[PDB]
Design a protein around this ligand. Structure first.
Ligand SMILES: [Fe+3]
Ligand SMILES: [Fe+3]
Ligand SMILES: [Fe+3]
Ligand SMILES: [Fe+3]
Ligand SMILES: [O]
Ligand SMILES: [Zn+2]
Lengths: 158, 158
């Protein structure tokens, strides 16, 4: 059980990528077909499952583009700033990054509302219950991720 | 709390250095005079105290040179190996580094045995109680330090 205090910016970014980015990206690939099946089968008579599908999709692609910007563009800046080099939009960067976290957040709220905190109705079975199950764990994984970035990584630079 | 398995060999090595190596060095600066003093004072009265001074000093000079071996020659050889460059001598390193861990190992046992189990007599006061506390302190940081290397960093490359 590491103390993050002792991880520098470059290594903490690494941990965030191995523990959160790469695990999230993979799950978004495995879950997505289940989430679309649930909406195609039981959406016809449960419309909220389609709102769930549509919301999950938006949260999903929101994450994936966001991470790409962090990995390929914005974490490199967070490093070179703490590596001394002049990065004059460091405050801009960090601001857009929380704008993104906030927004993905109120999206996770929406999914948690629609599912009633991921408790299936009894008349759910099979896919329906797995979808809820995995989303709940994804909601948890996403909160940890962003809390680590927000309250650890973004404070080492500012 | 953070999971060390997700760090790669180079991020983990940085962690070892900040969290363990640089602390241990700085503590050896601070604690060494007290050991010598407690040995000088109540050491005649009780000789096992000077057995302790000489045992601690051996474990000190040991750790110190062994961490410089890792910092200057062997944590490089491990990074360059994880990075894909051709490092033979790799298991020769991993095997000497545990040769030195197993060493500090049975040595820390003896310091602990010498000093009841870091239990100070009823005669002890001031100097004598600080040293035992700071040693049992130091004794546990080394367990963490050499358990991290042994079962994470070394099992990463192996
Ligand atoms: Fe991220
Ligand atoms: Fe993020
Ligand atoms: Fe070490
Ligand atoms: Fe070591
Ligand atoms: O993220
Ligand atoms: Zn797109």
């Amino acid at each position: 059980s590491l103390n993050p205090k002792f991880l520098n910016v470059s290594s903490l970014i690494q941990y965030i990528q191995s523990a959160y980015h790469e695990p999230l990206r993979e799950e978004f690939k495995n879950l997505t077909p289940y989430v679309t099946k649930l909406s195609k089968v039981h959406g016809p008579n449960h419309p909220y499952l389609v709102e769930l599908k549509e919301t999950y999709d938006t949260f999903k692609n929101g994450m994936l583009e966001h991470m790409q910007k962090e990995d390929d563009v914005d974490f490199p800046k967070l490093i070179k700033y703490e590596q001394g080099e002049v990065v004059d939009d460091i405050n801009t960067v960090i601001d857009d990054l929380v704008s993104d976290h906030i927004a993905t957040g109120e999206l996770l709220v929406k999914m948690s509302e629609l599912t009633s905190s991921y408790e299936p109705p009894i008349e759910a079975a099979g896919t329906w219950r797995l979808v809820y199950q995995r989303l709940k764990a994804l909601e948890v994984l996403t909160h940890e991720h962003v809390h680590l970035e927000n309250h650890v990584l973004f404070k080492k630079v500012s």
